[PDB]
Each structure stands twice: as structure tokens, then as C-alpha cells.
């Protein structure tokens, strides 16, 4: 659709997150840019209120799937761009195994030339000495595949997927994600055939940044609809 046209070049990104996990209140801001032709995100996130009370890796999925690279042969399955510029609501529940859960509601839309992700996060039932509030997770991120399904009654999409966070004692912390997206505007959107998104994430630090922060380099590519192209060879 015409939402596609908004992503042909590099697009500035602004992320704002208001959080409260077990009563620990915090704000995060992020800035950077996205290049959907390559599925590429480059963002720096800052906790503006002090030390982040949860580990940075647990916020990665919450902190703009419109920047995913949809291959040409899958362009008709790109819901996220089709909802632009008016945007979409993205809601999740994230259950950390043997710990608490996040509930997030975000609006992703253009403000002028800037793609904005505005998020509210509420976390409950965490263990104060667990892996999350105890900052026992490794500062890294595993590659992962997430299936995208159409949700016709809601004119949107759904996704359920698991994130595995590495724990410093050698184990793995499961984070079970349940996601729903719905357009904000009324124009037609692309409802996709079943497919998945392949992600990878590199987390790093800014040596000159005194605030608690995360530098993120992310690549996301849509895949899984293959048979028609395969027959060409």
C-alpha cells in the first residue's frame, strides 16, 4: 500500500516507555533510525530516572515491526507498514517462567517524519531476588523466530512466541510473549498469510554514557512463504 512508501529510506525513530515493575517506576527514552529495506534498526536507549530496575534484555521486544524487511514476494503480507502513517496499537503480555509478568500497550505511528513508539508497561508478581529484579541475566540476546498470524475480526495480527534469556548461573529464563496488533486508522490494511519474522540483536554500550543505557543493533526479516519462489529453480 502507500504505507510502504514511508519506509523506502532511512527513518528517524523515537521510543518512549513509561514503566512500573513491582512498584519500581522508571522511564526509558530511545532514539535512532530504521532502514526497512535492510530490516535494520540502530537505537540507543536511556533510563532517564536512574538505574533500570529490570534487565535491559527483557525490554528489547517491548522497545517497531514496521521496520522489518519484507521480501518483495511477501510485500502483500506486511501489515505493519500498511497501517502507516496512522499506525497501530501493539499489546503484549509477557510471562517470565517462575517469575512475574509484563503487560504492555504501545502506539506506533508517525509524528511528522519520525516513527514513534509510545509504550506503557506494568509488571506484577516478580520475585525481588529473582533473575529479573536481581539483574541475573546476561547482557546479550538470542536470535529467534516469531510466527505472525492474521486476526480478521480485529482487522489486525497476533503472535505468540518465546524468548530465552541467558542466566548467569548457566540456565535460561523463559519469557512467553502473547501479542496483538490492531490498526489505529480506518483505511484498509494488509492481513497476512501465516509467516514468521527472523530476528537478531546485538546489545552494546556507549563508553561516554553515564546514564543506564542500551545500544541496540537489530535486524528483522520476514520469511516462511517460500514454495512459489522455490519452483522457479
Rounded Cα gap, residues 183 and 160, in angstroms: 18
Please name the helix (run of DSSP H) or strand (run of DSSP E) that holds residue 228, with its range, or none. helix 227-230
Rounded Cα gap, residues 30 and 60, in angstroms: 11
Cβ atoms of 105 and 160 within 8 Å: the answer is no
3-state secondary structure of 152: helix
Cβ atoms of 220 and 198 within 8 Å: the answer is yes
What CATH number does the domain located at 3-230 have? 2.40.155.10
φ, ψ of residue 187 to 5 degrees: the values are -55, 160
Domain residue spans of the chain? 3-230
Cβ atoms of 36 and 1 within 8 Å: the answer is no
**Entry resolution (Å):** 1.5
Enumerate residues 6+ apart whose C-beta is below 8 A from 108. Answer: 64, 66, 80, 87, 88, 89, 90, 115, 116, 117, 118
Cβ atoms of 217 and 38 within 8 Å: the answer is no
CB-side neighbour CA atoms (13 Å) of 46: 11
Rounded Cα gap, residues 197 and 113, in angstroms: 25
Numbers of helices and strands, H then E, in the chain: 2, 11
Q: How far is CA 147 from CA 25, 72, 106, 164, 197, in A?
A: 32, 19, 20, 16, 6
Rounded Cα gap, residues 220 and 90, in angstroms: 17
Q: How far is CA 25 from CA 9, 49, 143, 167, in A?
A: 36, 8, 29, 24
Amino acid at each position: 500500500s502507500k504505507g510502504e512508501e514511508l519506509f523506502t529510506g532511512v527513518v528517524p525513530i523515537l521510543v518512549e516507555l513509561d514503566g512500573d515493575v513491582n512498584g519500581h517506576k522508571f522511564s526509558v527514552s530511545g532514539e535512532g533510525e530504521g532502514d526497512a529495506t535492510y530490516g535494520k534498526l540502530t537505537l540507543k536507549f536511556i533510563c532517564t530516572t536512574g538505574k533500570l530496575p529490570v534487565p535491559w534484555p527483557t525490554l528489547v521486544t517491548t522497545l517497531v515491526l514496521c521496520f522489518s524487511r519484507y521480501p518483495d514476494h511477501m510485500k502483500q503480507h506486511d501489515f505493519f507498514k500498511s497501517a502507516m502513517p496512522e499506525g497501530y496499537v501493539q499489546e503484549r503480555t509477557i510471562f517470565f517462567k517462575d517469575d512475574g509478568n509484563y503487560k504492555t500497550r504501545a502506539e506506533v505511528k508517525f509524528e511528522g517524519d519520525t516513527l514513534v513508539n509510545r509504550i506503557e508497561l506494568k509488571g506484577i508478581d516478580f520475585k525481588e531476588d529473582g533473575n529479573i529484579l536481581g539483574h541475573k541475566l546476561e547482557y546479550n540476546y538470542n536470535s529467534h523466530n516469531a510466527y505472525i498470524m492474521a486476526d480478521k475480526q480485529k482487522n489486525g495480527i497476533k503472535s505468540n512466541f518465546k524468548i530465552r534469556h541467558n542466566i548467569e548461573d548457566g540456565s535460561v529464563q523463559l519469557a512467553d510473549h502473547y501479542q496483538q496488533n490492531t490498526p489505529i486508522g480506518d483505511g484498509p490494511v494488509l492481513l497476512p498469510d501465516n509467516h514468521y519474522l527472523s530476528t537478531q540483536n546485538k546489545l552494546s554500550k556507549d563508553p561516554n554514557e553515564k546514564r543506564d543505557h542500551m545500544v541496540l543493533l537489530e535486524f528483522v526479516t520476514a520469511a516462511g512463504i517460500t514454495l512459489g519462489m522455490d519452483e522457479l529453480y
